[PDB]
Amino acid sequence: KTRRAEVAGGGFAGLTAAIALKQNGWDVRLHEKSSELRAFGAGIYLWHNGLRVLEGLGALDDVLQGSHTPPTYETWMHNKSVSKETFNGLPWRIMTRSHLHDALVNRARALGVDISVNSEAVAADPVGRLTLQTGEVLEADLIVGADGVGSKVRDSIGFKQDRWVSKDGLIRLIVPRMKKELGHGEWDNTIDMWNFWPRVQRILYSPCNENELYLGLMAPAADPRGSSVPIDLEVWVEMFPFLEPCLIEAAKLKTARYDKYETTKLDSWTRGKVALVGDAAHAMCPALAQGAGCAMVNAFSLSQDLEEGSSVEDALVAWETRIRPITDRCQALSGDYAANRSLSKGNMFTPAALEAARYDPLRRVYSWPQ
Amino acid sequence: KTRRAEVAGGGFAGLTAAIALKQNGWDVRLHEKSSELRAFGAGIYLWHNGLRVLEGLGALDDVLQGSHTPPTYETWMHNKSVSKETFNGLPWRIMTRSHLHDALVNRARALGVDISVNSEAVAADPVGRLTLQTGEVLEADLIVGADGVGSKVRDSIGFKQDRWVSKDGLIRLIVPRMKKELGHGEWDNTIDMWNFWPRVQRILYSPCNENELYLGLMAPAADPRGSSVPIDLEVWVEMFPFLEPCLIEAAKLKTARYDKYETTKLDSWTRGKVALVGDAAHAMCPALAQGAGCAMVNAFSLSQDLEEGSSVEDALVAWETRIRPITDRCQALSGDYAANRSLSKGNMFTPAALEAARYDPLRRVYSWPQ
Amino acid sequence: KTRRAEVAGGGFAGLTAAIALKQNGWDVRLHEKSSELRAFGAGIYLWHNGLRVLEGLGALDDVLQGSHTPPTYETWMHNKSVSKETFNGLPWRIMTRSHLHDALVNRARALGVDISVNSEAVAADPVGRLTLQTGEVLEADLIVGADGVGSKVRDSIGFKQDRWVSKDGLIRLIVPRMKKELGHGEWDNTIDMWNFWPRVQRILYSPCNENELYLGLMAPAADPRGSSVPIDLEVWVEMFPFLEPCLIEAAKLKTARYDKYETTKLDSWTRGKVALVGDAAHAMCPALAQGAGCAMVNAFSLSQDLEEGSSVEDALVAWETRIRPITDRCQALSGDYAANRSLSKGNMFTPAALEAARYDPLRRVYSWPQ
Amino acid sequence: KTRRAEVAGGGFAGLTAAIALKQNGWDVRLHEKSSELRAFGAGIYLWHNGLRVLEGLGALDDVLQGSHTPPTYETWMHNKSVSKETFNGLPWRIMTRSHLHDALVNRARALGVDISVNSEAVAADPVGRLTLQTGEVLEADLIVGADGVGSKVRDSIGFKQDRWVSKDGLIRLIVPRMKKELGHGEWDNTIDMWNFWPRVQRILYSPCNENELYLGLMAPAADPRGSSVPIDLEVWVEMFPFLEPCLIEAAKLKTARYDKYETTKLDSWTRGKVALVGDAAHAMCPALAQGAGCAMVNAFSLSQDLEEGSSVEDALVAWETRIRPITDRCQALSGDYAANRSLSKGNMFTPAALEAARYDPLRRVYSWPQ
């Protein structure tokens, strides 16, 4: 009578699914392809929606400890402050990726989720069979494809899809705060520092805690200096001289990567006993900082629909119908914002922009009205 | 088998108790002495702790709609900004008293709490008897004394106590925002505007929403002009000229009162089947903006302890033991702050100051670390 | 024994020459080609050097009354303040062109300078003969060619020269201050408001007094909207929205012109009894705001050299040798600044930039050290 | 035929008189009581009027080199900026006392003024006799009493007078700028930093040049800590913490003095061939920073009246009649400002306040209109 779930992928989506299912009495095993449990991307923003998932997962405490809510989300254009936004009290948080990942892994382990590394799902069958690269075939009542933009759970089954990999991208790093060295200013703020002149270069400045600063350095791929790794210190200091202390530390990082944006959209997220969650289903532009938020809401919501006494197949259909439109709208709006460079104007966290963030997955209503 | 509760007082404490008990299946009747259900005091701050009570009461949505979280809590001394505090993301909110009261009344009514007006508790018996001014004697399994600083539930039984009524006080009003007329500034902020020179006059500036502004005008009773009602417009405009548009509206209010501060502390909060909650038990100085927050946490916590399968008498003892120290510490610290004028320095919402605010009554842990 | 001077041109150079010579006992007649005595160009800056000429001319009082020294000379790039300069106390002043012109005309009249309008010099002879368009031939001991960039005194004689008329230019206007309507800011400042993005548009904001504001609206000739007269209100408000009240008034002016920059440089400024002064000799780019300053210093200096007991011919040679290098350097540096857009960086009023301004023609030394 | 002048006192008044007379062909001897030529008081402000005297004395160049005009004269009350004043371009300057004194001494020496030290005037006779402490009796056509508030030239003759020495005063010091250590701010400004709460303490912050800062630390004599010398570092840092780097240097100065304010007013300034100039005649409160300015204007004006071909006795009478009302008005207004603490309000350099500053002694008119 113990339902069995097999989860492919140990990112935020897979860990969320695994914890949520285990809390509801599922026998859960999670399979991570990589040799270690790790999260790439340097830093990450969560909002009310994702923080509520964490509360629902019993992992909120560990996350809030050692992460940061800036006093304001500030936008600059050509070094002129154009907006300061606080979202009418809507909760939000910045943290390192490792911080969020560790909290989730620790919670999954505390609950007794069986986690395997070097364990890649290479095929999934809608009847409830997952095949690993080792040739092991696992039977389950539920298969969760949380295996990222390149999901083999998805592609082994075949889902009609549009995927896009941009030519442009950015360099994401964690460096020391160097707060004193930054001198006068509001250095606890998020500051999105846009420029189009004299060149297209932007830094998203994102404090994670008293020690760690998350920087995103964005320049076009066609710019050989701005897109260089390790960073071309001179061209960054030239346009962001007020960040020189931090940029000097950034230039030391030989692990720096220029990572490209990538999106996925599918005609459906389910097939029989298989559900696709996270980037496997709905990778999106990061303008609204909701890729993981939506992934986590969707994973948590999946566990909710599986508590209705329905067949797994029916629960999965109900789940997508219920929760997908929030994600579709957020993905579309984030892509629109990215293409139009809407964030450069400031004051763009409108009620519509904040729809996903306002959703409370625990009570299934929208909170924090704007 | 339906447990019966009789609640004396229709303030925030009594309404919270009534809703929380009704949600847990108690047959609840609430008795308000006044001819109408009303809340005095103009405006009010709630923090995470109180907002979590509201969530637990199913009244959070109605409260957040039409209330305000300032971008920052700012302090001025002699018109110089000395601090801006955002509490590392700790949720907080400002609203009119009527806004909070209405949300609670509407929720109690929706749940079918029996509410009587012109119904004053004049005596309570620890065996579970409440006598109204009408001579009606009501039997119950639980009596809640939520009847304010002058609690007759408390005083009919006899509780060792120290009460204090200050000679000093303040004038609290709601006026239009007049935001455009205030011109350049950060007029969505809370701004605590202190002065000792040329006279002791202070205004706590507290936006409630896009339409309503809560002002507290504080001057010593020995100052015949600053303590006058309706307000002596000239002496307020002289020291707060930047608020003239709002003060002109304030001066129109012939309902204005100079209300005195009042505190209560008791050796215990329980006797048999009687529990004292709110100002009946623990009225405190308003420096930490936690009088109602603690009252609401205590009322909600009472309902929790009554779900343990214990006798009512034992549950009440357990309740006070569990929850009272948070209130004792907050009351003491708020009184210390008031006497030392500590808030005038700015940056005084320390981790210790925020202890009560950080408490989450739903999960019974402290959240939002500083 | 009364030396006779004939001056061609009633601009700042010619009026300065006429007053200075008349003060020294010359019989002076001045000939203005136009039907009225008028000054075009809306507004003008003078510095210490030009203010000292005015003192020497007995016209300083009338100029300082009704003109303005801003508290600072401020530069913006893309709406971000990049510098505020006060030149270590070096005197400077902004005024309407008419204000300066009127003061000079009134002083010349008070001294009994004979002024003719509709009186154009069409030929000059180094032996001391000036021919007017009327055919009148005037004999004099000194002929002053103060007849502008298109000087016929110069060109009738033949001076080796390089002249340049730019394709680009600007629209100069006087509008009401609208100070209250501009709201919060430092609206008594000079503010040089540069932009390259989203288009090349710049406004030099120059208060003249409590009533009048001098604006220079600069856009490339290749921009059909930004270079349009009367002004294309929308494209100016878009990039300078904080000046909308003033720009609305500017758009009413059907007299607005897009005037082109023009320079002149000559191998010499003298021939026999003929001296060329002002734009006739040394028109320059306006970056250092010294075209008229140098013109006035040169005209005044001419009068000084004529007091040495030398022949007029020798005095003129001595004059150019003594005073020309200040002008040559200023012209070259202003042209360099214009071409490199150096002023866009702010903090460019260096000691070298301010050399002409620092010169005191009365004492013949440099003052106001930097 | 060479007129002989004997000047008592080598302060700013006596040096000005000596230079001005020597320039006009007087045989001038100056007698300084002290063993060295020195100026006490740390720093000093001059305005247009005094700068024009310096121009008239041929000492302006040496003064402007190595002195400072702040970008603005700023006033703070309780650390809040209440005004920024630039006087519509009216020239002004801050310098060390030694800087001004040296320039004057060097000019007097260059002109061949005979200067004696350890040479005290102890008696003067209206017939033109000056007696030194050595017993030497000097005959002259003019005797100038420029010997300070305690003038023996004045008191040996007997002038009806009111003198006042205040109980209160201030500590004036020169310290290093420590500009970098002061961090963010407008540290080239004059800043008059007033406080009445928590104690009456004020600092006038006055940069003299890139190296030297003039500070005036003002507290009541009844305050044993604030009036202490060497300075009580703690009580100054407490109320001016932003000046700590400079105050630490100030506390090292064991030469610091708490000097009292002193005023003098006389029924007349002349007797026969004797003229009283400077503090000997008109010491005043320093609120308008015009004590030396008026002293210098008066000394220079004296030389002017002596060029009219009148008897010395008549010239002196004409001089006082012509020039004294400017000083009487300035003295009265400065005393009014001091007593009413008017400067604490900011924006008090009104046209009337600036009357003395606006006077141009060279042309004998008022300039720099407000």
Ligand SMILES: Cc1cc2nc3c(=O)[nH]c(=O)nc-3n(C[C@H](O)[C@H](O)[C@H](O)COP(=O)(O)OP(=O)(O)OC[C@H]3O[C@@H](n4cnc5c(N)ncnc54)[C@H](O)[C@@H]3O)c2cc1C
């Ligand atoms: C630049 C940038 C900035 C962003 N910023 C934010 C932000 O601020 N806030 C936010 O909420 N989101 C943000 N996002 C989006 C966020 O990174 C993703 O949406 C999120 O990490 C998706 O998580 P996931 O678990 O679906 O996928 P992934 O994080 O890709 O994790 C899947 C895990 O899949 C494992 N794996 C892959 N294939 C297999 C397999 N076949 N079998 C087993 N394991 C497999 C992968 O190795 C890995 O361990 C940002 C994205 C980008 C690109």
Ligand SMILES: Cc1cc2nc3c(=O)[nH]c(=O)nc-3n(C[C@H](O)[C@H](O)[C@H](O)COP(=O)(O)OP(=O)(O)OC[C@H]3O[C@@H](n4cnc5c(N)ncnc54)[C@H](O)[C@@H]3O)c2cc1C
């Ligand atoms: C100036 C000031 C500012 C404050 N600001 C804040 C703030 O910002 N945030 C915050 O959390 N707290 C604040 N407080 C404290 C807050 O006002 C109180 O702690 C709170 O209202 C107490 O609620 P209560 O229900 O216990 O009592 P009450 O609000 O006094 O309500 C009891 C209700 O008792 C009814 N009643 C009385 N006697 C009887 C009886 N015998 N029988 C039946 N009914 C009876 C009373 O009429 C009334 O309807 C502030 C207090 C003051 C004085």
Ligand SMILES: Cc1cc2nc3c(=O)[nH]c(=O)nc-3n(C[C@H](O)[C@H](O)[C@H](O)COP(=O)(O)OP(=O)(O)OC[C@H]3O[C@@H](n4cnc5c(N)ncnc54)[C@H](O)[C@@H]3O)c2cc1C
């Ligand atoms: C955009 C711009 C901004 C500027 N801003 C400043 C500034 O802020 N400060 C500054 O000092 N300078 C400034 N200048 C330069 C300043 O305008 C000139 O250098 C100055 O006006 C030259 O004066 P002028 O007397 O030599 O010539 P003009 O002003 O040209 O005057 C000559 C006079 O010549 C009369 N005339 C012409 N031909 C004859 C003839 N044949 N016979 C008789 N009369 C004749 C002309 O009609 C006229 O009345 C600026 C210039 C430009 C273009």
Ligand SMILES: Cc1cc2nc3c(=O)[nH]c(=O)nc-3n(C[C@H](O)[C@H](O)[C@H](O)COP(=O)(O)OP(=O)(O)OC[C@H]3O[C@@H](n4cnc5c(N)ncnc54)[C@H](O)[C@@H]3O)c2cc1C
């Ligand atoms: C706190 C303070 C701040 C001030 N700030 C300013 C300011 O910013 N700007 C400004 O313009 N003014 C200022 N003043 C006023 C200024 O200090 C005086 O007005 C000025 O120094 C007066 O100069 P004096 O030459 O008349 O007298 P003094 O400076 O007193 O000089 C007279 C000289 O007299 C010599 N002496 C005295 N007796 C004899 C004698 N019997 N025989 C020979 N020699 C004699 C004295 O030793 C000395 O060398 C300030 C004054 C004070 C108190």
Ligand SMILES: O=C(O)c1cncc(O)c1
């Ligand atoms: O626009 C972005 O690339 C972006 C990336 N991360 C967070 C965010 O709010 C925006």
Ligand SMILES: O=C(O)c1cncc(O)c1
């Ligand atoms: O100090 C107060 O009186 C006070 C009153 N209300 C809220 C608060 O934070 C402080």
Ligand SMILES: O=C(O)c1cncc(O)c1
């Ligand atoms: O750069 C200019 O065009 C310019 C024009 N007028 C004054 C000035 O300082 C600069």
Ligand SMILES: O=C(O)c1cncc(O)c1
């Ligand atoms: O008020 C003063 O003591 C004062 C002292 N020096 C200059 C000044 O402007 C004011």
